[PDB]
């Protein structure tokens, strides 16, 4: 059970720069190390196989190195839409098996920008259906990693929320996220203070948006 | 040509032999090779030489024939003084490139010793994991030794050129070939020497693994 | 020149079994291993093991032991994967990969042949139309939106004010809920001094059910 740990998780760069990704291994590795990229909605692409050999079609920008337990992928003159997720990969052992990295995200480098937080109470039409949904918006922030927590009358909610993130906007290079909280019509009317508390690198302190029931 | 290697292997025993065929760090013994006997434990016979476990050097093999690809796993190495790989064919001798899939496909290992002919003997491994060897025919020279190699001590006229039947060049040396540690895993500790054979006047420069 | 053809995208009731297919071009596999790698929506590439068709040797990864089974014939074109007792976590895309392997002699590791992927969605559900709910504005700029909730399957397409308002619009990727249905939010940020006067409507279009809904989002009272 070789475990390829890949770092960084996210690399924040701009075109023209050199992107270096590392992959360390719980054990030694018999060459046949591979690097893959994946663009959203598309299947993984082979970049380097056998630690350093460039696949067919891969531009000379991509260089491989490593041996033993430590391997790095070297991307020179970062061009547009070399920006994607990257996986390191090893083949071998008996019975023959695949081990993959956890992944690395190249995003377009930006200034830190905090989220704009808006909270939406459940529709009166939705309440007529027997379900309440509460929505929390984080509108245009950077970097991608923002944490959201739902507190209903000061009770942290686990297993009631679900969230989505957009892809980095072509023009502002920022991200957006909306988290959706679900409650029964009765359980929603069993409480008063519905809160959305956001954590982000642009925020020296938690930002909490909230509303009172019916008010 | 890699396609011509017979490849019918089940390893229901979990012997471990299947992994060793493919990955170098999965190589397979000191308990079981204690049946092999040194050449000194046998007795001299000087009567005129007539012709008669597989990993013991003193194995007396039957002469090589044609064997079905059905029962073969891994490559088949036949030995002139030097190593050579024999692939799958049909019963008429024409090469078959189907990984041994056909029940008809066979390996033609029939041997007539060089210099006259082809090879001294061959080794392969069957499907259950057992090394199997043919060659010769070996030489008939409680401790009788039917010579498969260069038994100069027990009969002067029994030399590898005269009595050879397989990879064993002397009772203590076997030819080194890429899959030697697969067919004879217990020869792992052997030291390797650059050696040279003269059989029919052709120089056979090869490497040899010895004790 | 080897190509792989995988099974079609399936949808299975949670707690059933699903069999996905992997067929190769060049007659049968040989000396090659046919490995399986999954990827849940958005997550990483998560290997599952494989089978080596010539020998029958099965490889199971630790994350899926006991519910997955790999089958193939010694000289068939097709290798199989069956996954039993599906939950919504299993909703993912499954790849098969044909490769040659070895470290040692005649047999060295060659080949990276991937299938096209097989989407498997795990829901109790059948084609259902969305429920469009307003996210009314309340508090510079204000935010408002539409909550497209409880529809199956993807895709829906949201646009605003018949397409004249696109600037500042975010439609977030949808999420598979515990019901097996999908839920989506499109929002747009607009000038705060416009709310009572500029009318805002979102256009939800769910092709699989021929459901078209136009819900007016007006600030709450
Ligand atoms: C690979 O070679 C081995 C031998 O090295 C084959 O195994 C042998 O198979 C035969 C019959 O298939 C066994 O015969 C049995 O002998 C016992 C004697 O105790 C007898 O009581 C039974 O009625 C039967 O005749 C033999 O024991 C067995 N030897 C061993 C120990 O393996 C093996 O079948 C070969 N694999 C192939 C050809 O796929
Ligand atoms: C495996 O067998 C096939 C025939 O069964 C061999 O076939 C040719 O290989 C060359 C390699 O460059 C190809 O260009 C041809 O198109 C192949 N087919 C034909 C028309 O014969 C193949 O070489 C064998 N592979 C090995 C290395 O053993
Ligand atoms: C595999 O074995 C079969 C045995 O039936 C071979 O069959 C022959 O096929 C040719 C096709 O041109 C016929 O003309 C022969 O009459 C068949 N012979 C027999 C014994 O029926 C087949 O050729 C074999 N394939 C390989 C890989 O050698
Ligand atoms: C081959 O040589 C190795 C040492 O290089 C032998 O390994 C040792 O064998 C003794 C037996 O008396 C054991 O007590 C030790 O534990 C072994 N050490 C290691 C490193 O495993 C080995 O037995 C020799 N023979 C074969 C055929 O394996
Ligand atoms: C391997 O050998 C065993 C024991 O004879 C047999 O039962 C098994 O079916 C063989 N496996 C295959 C797939 O050939
Ligand atoms: C080779 O040996 C076989 C037995 O394995 C025998 O039938 C055949 O005639 C011999 N000669 C040939 C054709 O190679």
From TrEMBL, chain B:
<feature type="disulfide bond">
    <location>
        <begin position="147"/>
        <end position="151"/>
    </location>
</feature>
<feature type="glycosylation site" description="N-linked (GlcNAc...) asparagine">
    <location>
        <position position="3"/>
    </location>
</feature>
<feature type="domain" description="Hepatitis C virus Non-structural protein E2/NS1">
    <location>
        <begin position="1"/>
        <end position="211"/>
    </location>
</feature>
<comment type="similarity">
    <text>Belongs to the hepacivirus polyprotein family.</text>
</comment>
<feature type="glycosylation site" description="N-linked (GlcNAc...) asparagine">
    <location>
        <position position="10"/>
    </location>
</feature>
<feature type="disulfide bond">
    <location>
        <begin position="64"/>
        <end position="134"/>
    </location>
</feature>
<feature type="disulfide bond">
    <location>
        <begin position="78"/>
        <end position="122"/>
    </location>
</feature>
<feature type="glycosylation site" description="N-linked (GlcNAc...) asparagine">
    <location>
        <position position="102"/>
    </location>
</feature>
<feature type="glycosylation site" description="N-linked (GlcNAc...) asparagine">
    <location>
        <position position="142"/>
    </location>
</feature>
<feature type="disulfide bond">
    <location>
        <begin position="9"/>
        <end position="73"/>
    </location>
</feature>
<feature type="disulfide bond">
    <location>
        <begin position="139"/>
        <end position="163"/>
    </location>
</feature>
<feature type="glycosylation site" description="N-linked (GlcNAc...) asparagine">
    <location>
        <position position="189"/>
    </location>
</feature>
<feature type="disulfide bond">
    <location>
        <begin position="173"/>
        <end position="210"/>
    </location>
</feature>
<feature type="glycosylation site" description="N-linked (GlcNAc...) asparagine">
    <location>
        <position position="28"/>
    </location>
</feature>
<feature type="disulfide bond">
    <location>
        <begin position="36"/>
        <end position="56"/>
    </location>
</feature>
<feature type="glycosylation site" description="N-linked (GlcNAc...) asparagine">
    <location>
        <position position="110"/>
    </location>
</feature>
<protein>
    <recommendedName>
        <fullName>Genome polyprotein</fullName>
    </recommendedName>
</protein>
<feature type="disulfide bond">
    <location>
        <begin position="29"/>
        <end position="186"/>
    </location>
</feature>
